[PDB]
């Protein structure tokens, strides 16, 4: 298979605007949302049909209870942070935990926190320690590292549980996650040459411009990989033309183990 990943995020907001949830948690497999929970609905719900169709109601009931607890814990943790930063107003707290199963069968696992959108604490599951970016984080690092058993627990979760669940979800969603829709690629002039691709899945794609068989990495404008709305993606890359010399330009696209070259006449 291609590389796949499972990730769960949490967002906490300390003084949210009216209606906006103080707490949101969403899971993803690759780029696909699979689950959602927030402090308004108080329910964990599927966000992909292949998730809903394979997990019975008692599953959603169980994790609804767990997320209600995680929500309270996140509030307490954010209250502690903003008090120790001595910050007024509304601030954000974020968590991301997840794992990857790479093509060669190796795995990775990660867990980190952010305050106001900046790295706050980063777990190292090999040295079993927390990296702290400032002295507020340093205080939390010491409290968490004093609980050695919970660091061992997270290492096991990242390396064993997370990968087991990812494989389970990959099979649930295999029709979606393991498919391939090759790109449709074209060039036009706008003076710069624009190489454009659309209709492809998975979103991972590499487009670049070659001049006379040499890759001019610093002379290329790489567009973002963007969702088209229908489950497929689009992207582009442009290079500028030298009107003082003749050169052979070619757009190169790699997607899901297939390479394409479009030579510009």
């Amino acid at each position, epitope marked *: 298979m291609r590389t796949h990943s499972l990730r769960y995020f949490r967002l906490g907001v300390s003084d949210p605007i009216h209606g906006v949830p103080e707490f949101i948690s969403v899971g993803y497999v690759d780029s696909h949302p699979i689950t959602t929970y927030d402090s308004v609905t108080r329910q964990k719900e599927p966000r992909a049909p292949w998730m809903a169709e394979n997990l019975a109601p008692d*599953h959603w*009931e*169980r*994790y609804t*209870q*767990l997320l*209600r*607890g*995680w*929500q*309270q*814990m996140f509030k307490v943790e954010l209250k502690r942070l903003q008090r120790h930063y001595n910050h007024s107003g509304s601030h954000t707290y974020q968590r991301m935990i997840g794992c990857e199963l790479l093509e060669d069968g190796s795995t990775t696992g990660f867990l980190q926190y952010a305050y106001d959108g900046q790295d706050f604490l980063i777990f190292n599951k090999d040295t079993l320690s927390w990296l702290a970016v400032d002295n507020v984080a340093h205080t939390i690092k010491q409290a968490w590292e004093a*609980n050695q*058993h*919970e660091l*061992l*627990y*997270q*290492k*096991n*979760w990242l390396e*064993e*549980e997370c990968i*087991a*669940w990812l494989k389970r979800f990959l099979e649930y969603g295999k029709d979606t996650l393991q498919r391939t829709e090759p790109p449709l690629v074209r060039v036009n002039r706008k003076t710069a040459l624009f190489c454009k691709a659309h209709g492809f899945y998975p979103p991972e794609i590499y487009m670049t411009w070659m001049k006379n068989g040499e890759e001019i990495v610093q002379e290329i404008d790489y567009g973002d990989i963007l969702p088209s709305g229908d489950g497929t993606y689009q992207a582009w890359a442009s290079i500028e033309l030298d009107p003082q010399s003749s050169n052979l330009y070619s757009c190169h696209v790699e997607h899901s183990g297939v390479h394409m070259v479009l030579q510009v006449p």
Partner: antibody
Amino acid sequence: GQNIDQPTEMTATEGAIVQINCTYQTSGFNGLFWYQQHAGEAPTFLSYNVLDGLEEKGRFSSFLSRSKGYSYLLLKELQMKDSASYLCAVKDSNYQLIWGAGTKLIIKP
Amino acid sequence: NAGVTQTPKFQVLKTGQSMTLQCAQDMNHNSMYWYRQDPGMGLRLIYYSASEGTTDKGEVPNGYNVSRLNKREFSLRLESAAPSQTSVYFCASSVWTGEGSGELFFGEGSRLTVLE
């Protein structure tokens, strides 16, 4: 199905050593707990293992093998006050505890 | 610093009688639990409360209900007692749930005997 097994009862001699075994087959794994419960009293926490190996805590050690789904609680230099039941429990993939039925440890003075 | 305090320690009941077991923890824990313990089997969860303001059934909820009255207290109700509910009931608490290594702290137990 999920299950957890430990011997019903064990008898050993004061001053000696005893190893209490616990095997489990679970939907995922997030750690294994041992508790002590004296007759007519509350269970109290003894140990937690989640990676492979042995942890020591005074006269008690707890061992875990994840690939074998096996743990033991090792009691050294047995004293009469060690007479109690010993409960093994596994936290599964959904963070639910599965409890073994307990091993009653009898100590001969 | 009382830990987990549950009452009553003992209670005899007639079939069909109502009974409330009380439980309180002063450890500022978020998660509370009600178990029954019977000979020859492991502890069986009746109902739990992952956090203040939420509860849900465990493995053997039928015949029981609970109230997470506040962060400290978690009562267990037998509305119509049955002989099969003869058991020893344990209340427990933990700092959180949905974490790995956090242990349970148990109350002293409540021994109930239900008789025709």
